Every structure is written in C-alpha cells, then in structure tokens.
Design a protein around this ligand. Structure first.
Ligand SMILES: CC(=O)N[C@H]1[C@H](O[C@H]2[C@@H](O)[C@@H](CO)O[C@@H](O[C@H]3[C@H](O)[C@@H](O)[C@H](O)O[C@@H]3CO)[C@@H]2O)O[C@H](CO)[C@@H](O)[C@@H]1O[C@@H]1O[C@H](CO)[C@H](O)[C@H](O)[C@H]1O[C@@H]1O[C@@H](C)[C@@H](O)[C@@H](O)[C@@H]1O
Lengths: 158, 158, 159, 158
C-alpha cells in the first residue's frame, strides 16, 4: 500500500492496482488511449431513483441513466471502443467500502465488479495498452499485482 | 417443481418466479407494459470478444455490443422506461447454471444479477405492473415467492 | 454468521435480517417509528391453555389473550398503525427452533410466519421505514438480505 | 362429499367436517354455544390494504382491521370466550382454493389454518360442545372425520 496520492493524471505502470478512495466525486476515473478504449467509473450514492445525470467524460457532456435501489454505493463502469460511440454501462461495483480498482496488465484494463464482499476482477481488451492514461479525480493508492489478495480484501472489506 | 412449461406470450401471475431454462436462445425474455417498463434478457455464451450482435426486441432490431471473457454464461438485462429510448445494459447475471428469473411482485419487476453462487434479487419500478406481459422464448418453471429460497438455490447451484 | 449481539435498543440497518434467539423472554422485540407502525413479538411457550397475560409494549401495560395447543413455541406478532389504536394479533410463527426475524427493506417491515419448517416472510407497509427503531430483549444475529436463504434456513431448521 | 347444501342455521353433528365453499361473502361462519365459544370466519380477498372493515357478528356491529398482501384469499378466524368481550384475530387460513373447515369433535371446535397447500388443523376447547350451533352463509359439504385426509386434500388443493 503506497499512498495516499492526491488526484492526478498518469499512465499507471503495468502490473499495479490503483485503489481509488472517493468521498463524493461523481466521476472517479477517466481512462483512454484515444484509439480503442474509453473507461469511466461513475459513483452513484445510495437510494437514487431512476434518473438521467450529466457527467463530463473526456471533455464531452453526457446524459447517463442511473439507479441505485440499495443502501450501498455503486460504481458504474462506462465503456466504449470508438471515439464516436455512446458509452455502454458495462459493469457495476456495488460497495459499502467505497473503494474501487483500476489496473493495466496483460494487454488488458482490469476493474472490480459485483457486490462486496464478493467483488471480483474482470477486464476490457486493447491492442494499445501502453497508451492508456488515467485522469484520477480521487485520493488513491498503488498495490502491486503480487499483492492483489490484499487489494481484493480492501475492495471487499475496507 | 412446477413445469417445465413451453415458450409462450402471456401475463405471468404476481408472486411467482418464472425460472427460465434456455439452451442457447439469443433472447430469453421480453417483458413490457408498453408504458414505463421494457426489460429484455439476452443470453451471451462463454468466450465472446467485444462484438456487436443483432437482437430483435419487442419487434425492434437492435445492434448491441456484448462481451463475455468468462467460461460462464451471462444474461444481459437490457432496460428502458420510454418507448422512444435506446436500451441500457442495466444488470448482468453471470451463471454456472444457465438459469435466470423474472417475477412481478409488490409493484415491481424482480430479476437476479451478480455471479453464481452469489446472485441476488433487485427490482425495476413501474406505475403499471398489472399490464406487464412477457414473451418467454425458453422452457420455464414457476415457483411461488413463498419458496423464493428454492428459486435462489436453483439460480445459484442448478 | 454475524453475532451473537446482546439485547439492545437501536435502529436496525436497512436490508439486514435481525435473527432473534430467545430463551424464555415474554416480549422478544418492540419496533416502531412512532408514527405508522408498531410491531411487538410475544413468545408463548408450548402447551399454554387459553388465558390473559400481561405485556408491557412501548411502555404501556396490555392484557392479551394467548393460547398454544402445540409442543412448538409461538411468536405472536402484535401490530397497529396508529399511536391511538389497540394492538391486533396479526401473525403467528409456530417454531421448533425458537428463532424469529425482523428486517427493514423496500419501505416495509418483514417478519416470518406460519409453522417450521415451512415458515415464509410477509410484510407491513410504512411511509417512514428509516425511523423504525427496535428494543431487542434477546440475543440476536445479523444476516444481510443477500443471504436471506440462510436466514430462512436458520428460522426453519435452527442454528 | 355430502352436498352441496345451501346457507342455513343448524347444529352440526359431532365428528363431521363442514367444508365451506364461499364465493364472495364477508362472513363465512358464525358459531357459538352462547357460553364459552364464539368463532367467526371472515373472508378477505387478495391485495387488500390495511383497513378497518365492518362485520355483523352474532348481531353485534364490529370494526375489524384486516390486510391481505397476497394473491390468495384469507379466512380471518375471530374468537372470544365471553359474549361481552372483544373478538381477537386468533388464526388465519391463507388459501388459493377458497375452501375452509369447521368440525365439532371430542371437547373442541376445529378449523384449518396456515397457508395452502400446508394448511393444518387446530382447536378451541369448550366445556359445552353439544350446544355449539353455526350460521353458515355459504354453500357447504359434510364429511365424516374418518375421511379427514380427503377434507385436508380439498382444503389444500381444491
Ligand atoms: C396427533 C393427532 O392425531 N392429531 C389429530 C387430532 O387428534 C385429536 C384426537 O386424537 C383426540 C382424541 O380423540 O385427542 C386430541 O388431543 C388433545 C385434545 O384436543 C385436547 O383437547 C386435550 O386437552 O388433550 C388431547 C390429547 O389426547 C387430538 O388432537 O384430531 C384432529 C381433528 O380431527 C386432526 O386434525 C389431527 O390430525 C393431525 O393433524 C395434523 C394437522 O392437520 C396433520 O394432518 C397430522 O398428520 C394429522 O395426523 C393424522 O391424522 C389423524 C387422524 C391420526 O390418524 C394421526 O395418526 C395421523 O397422523
């Protein structure tokens, strides 16, 4: 656990997790290589009735549908592979820890999804992992992949 | 265990789980009241690369991007509350079992989501539950909400 | 399995079961938001002939007729929706496990009723769920709604 | 099945089930010996919001609170053992058959309670069983106690 770090932008190094530690930022992280991957993590608070909210993603103003019927926080992982496409709601991380993850590894972009305390890893695929750069809007930490079991413990139990 | 029943277009009774038992149908279920709820369950088999597939939802042809990196099956739950809107990927049921659920209950439509064996129920809201009808493209079973534990057990372990 | 917790007076979190484990307490649980829901669980031991017993519910003394013809324990679920109304005997849980359940979920209070090992949930509606507070007179456990099928298993077949 | 019989006021014989077959009556049965047994079965249709309803029981105007969250019918068993006492809601039969039972046997008045198809018998005891008389508001059948397993089948499955 290296940190905490203040909000910044950088190409996270390969084989390390970024552990994201929002307070109430709407947009937690923007990641793109400007070719074939745009990923954004949106934070929806508990007890949100189905509505359209405005988010600024990669400088573009977007209306995205959100709902949270639970007493947990939901990270909406929004994804597109074309600069011109609309975002898809690809994954959800449902959390009473309010921690999320981002990693560049094995030509993939890895996140956590599902509901704490059983949240697990999945990925999106790229031909251009080296060019993936993240704007991180929250305090964060850096955990090596050799220590993912601790990262998964912090995501699931805090 | 009540069934199996053949695929049909019908109004499911309130307070019963429809336990859906597909082989490899693309579109498992289409539910709508034609006013404020459209829900479709799409079945995505293991080891699908990011790709746009065609699905006919309520007589509308849709090009929907899907991905499954896993050796499990995924039910993509597509949702909208307006006839003129595009479908959003609301939820995912990642399944060892290839079973999914649908129930009209207590003013809401209920489905399962998450990853087996930890799939859980959540709802979508409507002011018009009584007119919600389903096209079911798969063989199904009917479980009373009273036996919701048995339905969770089938969803989670087969 | 989260607990045991000691008897207490607190505001149970939404979307968790409280699993109530009495010995011989008369009043197991008293839940109210002081506006539109009062729920009390009374515990009537096996082989009780028709009789009036005294209970203190929400600091008021009540005379409630009870009976239990069985070798199982009965949780009498007493209810009202008005501070000015009398309690009615709304539900019964007939139990070999001596376990009962309470949950705040989906704008409702949820309890178990019927007879082990086939007890099922039902609900009481409220305009103000989050103000429901509970005096719990017994040892208890906490089970997330995500694990309700475990809670149902415990209710029906025991700890 | 001995019947059908039309609604009537009579003294049922001991060791016979009266199988009650309501349509839409508020009050199914009023039984008393005018000494230590008063029992009324009220019928409450599906999807009834907590409300105060009016019933005439043994000539008395009563306001009783009822609720039925379910899509089954509920028989509210109302009891007292003194003519000047309030009724208590002693038992419920939650039913998709709409069949209920009444029997004078041994030292007791018997009814069904619980939820179909798991409905079971229970009793109220009396020192005056032979003077128990019933106003039956509904079509009914008579079944000997020797055939109670058929009575339980009918109550539970139709
Ligand atoms: C256990 C049993 O047989 N219960 C049935 C009940 O039997 C009553 C009679 O045996 C009666 C003597 O003739 O004794 C009653 O016991 C009490 C008195 O009521 C009480 O006043 C007194 O103070 O103490 C005595 C103790 O002797 C018994 O309760 O009769 C019921 C009325 O017909 C009948 O419904 C009940 O049958 C059982 O009920 C449950 C729920 O409905 C299940 O179906 C059981 O399977 C069922 O038992 C089965 O049927 C009966 C006829 C009998 O053959 C059982 O062996 C059989 O399993």
């Amino acid at each position: 656990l290296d940190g905490p770090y203040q909000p910044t932008n950088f190409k996270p190094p390969n084989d390390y997790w970024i552990l994201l530690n929002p307070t109430n930022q709407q947009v937690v992280l923007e990641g793109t290589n400007k070719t074939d991957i745009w990923v954004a993590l949106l934070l929806v608070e508990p007890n949100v009735t189905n509505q359209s909210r405005q988010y600024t993603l990669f400088g573009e103003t977007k209306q995205i549908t959100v709902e949270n019927n639970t007493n947990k926080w939901k990270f909406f992982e929004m994804f597109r592979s074309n600069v011109s496409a609309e975002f898809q709601h690809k994954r959800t991380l449902t959390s009473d820890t309010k921690l999320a993850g981002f990693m560049k590894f094995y030509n993939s972009v890895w996140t956590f999804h599902g509901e704490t305390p059983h949240a697990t890893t999945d990925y999106s695929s790229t031909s251009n992992l080296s060019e993936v750069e993240t704007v991180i809007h929250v305090e964060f930490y850096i955990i090596p992949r050799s220590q993912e079991s601790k990262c998964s413990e912090y995501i699931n139990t805090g």
